[PDB]
């Protein structure tokens, strides 16, 4: 569902950017939204986020 995953360092911050396209969701008719992907990322145990 992601075009890419990348890691960006700011001047004093570090984060990971994920680009989710709504085109693949609409073409597959998955009942998935961006905040759903966010809360699904929160439900990962090994990442400990």
């Amino acid at each position: 569902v992601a075009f890419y995953v990348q890691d960006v360092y700011k001047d004093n911050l570090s984060f990971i950017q994920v680009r989710i396209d709504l085109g693949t969701i609409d073409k597959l008719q998955l009942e998935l939204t961006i905040e759903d992907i966010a809360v699904a990322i929160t439900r990962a145990s090994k990442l400990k986020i």
């Binding site: 009942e31 998935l32 939204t33 905040e35």
Partner: protein, 215 residues
């Protein structure tokens, strides 16, 4: 959004319907017009204006049927309750069991949401003439007795068990045992020594009856 709200509402509605069927199957008095509650009426009555599900307005009491209290010597009223918290603590479980003891109910059903800690599991047996049963919501989305692979179970009273034992001339320990905490046994709420008659349907032989004893 619709995904976070309507699916949760539908799951809660189907869980409510399954709990209603479960309470009716135990012999308690529930009319057919309550168990066939459609989605629209449930959203109108048991749901908030902004679509949020409230569960403190969902708990209800159930009384025995005249036929059930005729066949079964003693049978009281249940108070089935749905907890609002997603992860129940020891405090709310203690509050629930205190409520059940105070209102003088013979049994109680505590439908939790996600998970219950063992520190709250250890406190459900605390009341001598009353019992507490816990059911997960995902364990209540689909009724298991309506499944094809599960044939009809029918509990038997103490006189019924005694008649069966006299007819087959055998002691209680010789019947094929069934564990409690089995899903069908949990559906029927079977105590130790209670005998359930099963009506199996095989293609070769037709309908034939077997028997089982809890624990």
């Amino acid at each position: 959004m619709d995904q976070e709200n309507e699916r949760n509402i539908s799951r809660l509605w189907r869980a409510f319907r399954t709990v209603k069927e479960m309470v009716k199957d135990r012999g308690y008095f529930i009319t057919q017009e309550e168990v066939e509650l459609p989605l629209e009426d449930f959203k109108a009555k048991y749901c908030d204006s902004m679509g949020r599900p409230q569960r403190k307005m969902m708990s209800f009491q159930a009384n025995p049927t005249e036929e059930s209290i005729s066949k079964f010597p003693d049978m009281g009223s249940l108070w089935v309750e749905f907890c609002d918290e997603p992860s129940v603590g020891v405090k709310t479980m203690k509050t629930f069991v205190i409520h059940i003891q105070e209102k003088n109910f013979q049994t109680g059903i505590f439908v939790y949401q996600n998970n219950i800690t063992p520190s709250a599991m250890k406190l459900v047996p605390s009341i001598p003439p009353a019992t507490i049963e816990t059911f997960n919501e995902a364990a209540l989305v689909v009724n298991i007795t309506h499944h094809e692979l599960v044939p009809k179970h029918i509990r038997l009273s103490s006189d019924e068990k005694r008649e069966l034992l006299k007819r087959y001339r055998l002691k209680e320990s010789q019947l094929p045992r069934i564990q409690r905490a089995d899903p069908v046994a949990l559906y029927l709420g079977l105590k130790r020594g209670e005998v359930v008659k099963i009506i199996r349907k095989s293609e070769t032989s037709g309908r034939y009856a077997s028997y089982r004893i809890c624990m």
